[PDB]
């Protein structure tokens, strides 16, 4: 299973994908850099999360990104579209 | 917002999508004529609720269950805007 954001940027950058993953990291009060197993799919951000020290699920944090969309948005530029869990 | 479960069905039936909800009701302990705005979409199922959240987060502790009971495979679960 992976985490996912949907953004409205086809393709969506890479730099601009970690970019959402710090902001969705510093609400969460996680290192960013617990994400892992990264890539950006067409408009897509995809991701997995690493054991950290908030015991913090992939199904927390993607649904952590629905609840903040509005400032990924504010501080991105991006519209956030979608955000779910897949395999 | 709606919620939605993306399958592998091409394209998705009305009756499948419904019997998701069906089952996803059970498992929240609501009425499933809670479930509201229904739609199925090339293989998507998408609805509103009468939180999307916690709906979401159940489909995918019970993921294993849908699949069996309705037959098909459920690739993404979400909420949209
Ligand atoms: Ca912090």
Redesign the interface.
Known sequence: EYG?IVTDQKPLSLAAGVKLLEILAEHVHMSSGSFINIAVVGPALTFRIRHNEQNLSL?DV??QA??V?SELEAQTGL?????????
């Open positions: 996912y199904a993607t649904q629905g609840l969309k519209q956030i579209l979608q955000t779910g869990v897949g395999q």
